[PDB]
Amino acid sequence: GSMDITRFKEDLKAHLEEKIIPFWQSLKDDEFGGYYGYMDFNLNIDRKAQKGCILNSRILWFFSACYNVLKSEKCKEMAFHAFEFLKNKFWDKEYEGLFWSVSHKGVPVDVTKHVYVQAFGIYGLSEYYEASGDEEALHMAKRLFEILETKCKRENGYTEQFERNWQEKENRFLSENGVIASKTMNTHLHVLESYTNLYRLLKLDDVYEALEWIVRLFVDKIYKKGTGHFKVFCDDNWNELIKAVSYGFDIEASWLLDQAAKYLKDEKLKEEVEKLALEVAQITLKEAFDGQSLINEMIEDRIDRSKIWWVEAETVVGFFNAYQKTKEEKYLDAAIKTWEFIKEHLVDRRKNSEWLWKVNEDLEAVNMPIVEQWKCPYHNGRMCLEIIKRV
Ligand SMILES: O=C[C@@H](O)[C@@H](O)[C@H](O)[C@H](O)CO
Ligand SMILES: OC[C@H]1O[C@@H](O)[C@@H](O)[C@@H](O)[C@@H]1O
Known part of the structure; x- marks a missing residue:
């Protein structure tokens, strides 16, 4: 920590409290429950939009974690509204x-x-249990865990898609x-993430x-050894x-795996995982950080610099995590300059908005919905x- 890091945190806290939280509060659907499911690029909410379960669970997680960290009573009520839906x-x-x-x-x-969908449910329901103590939310999370483990798991990971009655299907992705x-x-990344929160x-x-x-x-099958x-x-x-590389998935999995490693009881595997996470953050900085922000992905030989x-x-988060473990300032510099990029190019300058979905290579805003x-x-x-x- 230092003076730059302290001001960094203060800046992100104010952004969350003055921009993020109140924007998503305005998406609350008091007519039918839950949260409105779409807002176009021109800031027009479609109150009749279909509502995705992943979005509701992410909103539930977000408002619960806001209460758990900031103890905002309004955020807990916002989480309750999402839990109810x-x-x-x-x-x-x-x-x-x-x-x-x-x-x-x-x-x-x-x-x-x-x-x-089930994993995000576990993630949000467990977070909401910490915030509310609601035993029904804890029950649903546990039941989702048992279903995943008893109906969906296979020798080399999870079968991903099922009919309503849990008969397996071919996948939709x-x-x-x-x-x-x-x-x-x-x-599988979000199974990992949800299970970490559940066990914590x-x-x-x-x-x-x-x-x-x-x-x-992740160590044995999903990671491409030696590539980052x-x-x-x-x-x-x-x-x-x-042959596809998602630099966003890489850097997210880096700090999520580092996070889970804190709980691991096998010390060999824990050292393995912590070394993997840093190898990924190192490769990510070298290959995908352009000095200003991170590019998107590489598909075969095509690079998307959006x-x-x-x-x-x-x-x-990933670069700040890498800085915390190594104390190498190249990571802290990269995380802050990425935040500075977000502030200049992705935080919408129009009133009553939030973050733009994306800007292209030329830093032009692209017509994409806000929600x-x-x-x-x-x-x-x-x-x-x-x-x-x-x-
Ligand atoms: O299709 C994209 C999404 O399903 C995810 O892959 C993406 O990483 C973010 O989660 C956006 O929500
Ligand atoms: O590769 C096809 C197979 O993939 C598995 O994970 C399941 O989805 C099976 O139902 C399917 O037959």
Whole structure:
């Protein structure tokens, strides 16, 4: 820590409190429950938009973590509102687990069960349990864990997509050329993340074993040894469908794996994981940090130098984490300058807005929604919360 790091945290706390929190408070749907599901680039909310379960759970996580860190009573009420919509509309009373999507009124639109959705449910419900003490939220998280472990897990990871009644299906995520990816970095990273939070709160043996198991899967199958990159979209045997590098996923997995490593009881694996996380952060700085911000991805030989909101948020956390473990100032410098880029190019200058989805290579804003099933307060809100907690 120093004077720059302290002012850094203060700046992120003010941004979260004066920009992020009140923006997402304005998305609260008091007519039907939950949160409005879409806001276009011109800041027009579509109150009738379908509501994604992942978005609701990320909002639940965000407001819960805000209460847990800042003790804001309004944030706890905002989390309650999202918990109520999860409980009443996304949770399947008959077969259990969480639907994929519902209408703005809460009518089930896509009742299939995806591990990606269940994991985010565990993440938000456990966070909300810490904030509220609600035993029903704790029950749902535990049941989601047992379902994942007893119905969805396989020898080499999770089957990712299921019918409503948990009969397995082929996956819904597709490679760039339309081949089904039976194994995705996406799903398994958020299983890891949700299990870390669950174990941190519960400290249960069964949960520890599943956490260690998923950490090992990342070390043994998903990580591309010696490259600093993880596989993104795979067949059922963790063979890449395409040579693809997501620098955003790399740097996020870097600090998430580092985080889980703190709980590991096998000291060899723990040293392994901490070395992996730093190898990834080192490669990421060298290959994807342009001196200003992080580029997006490389698909085969095509580089996308767009600046995506969640990539830069995770870059700030990942590089700050790398700085904390090494004390090498190149990482701290990179994290702060990425924050300075976000402030100048991704924080919307129009009133009553939040963060732009992306700017292109030429730093031009691109027409993309401000709120969508995949654009949430989770990444950028967690960026602020992490720095607040770490400094
Ligand atoms: O398609 C993109 C998303 O499903 C995620 O892959 C992405 O990393 C962020 O989570 C955006 O929400
Ligand atoms: O690769 C296809 C296979 O991938 C698995 O993970 C499951 O989704 C199976 O239902 C499917 O047959």
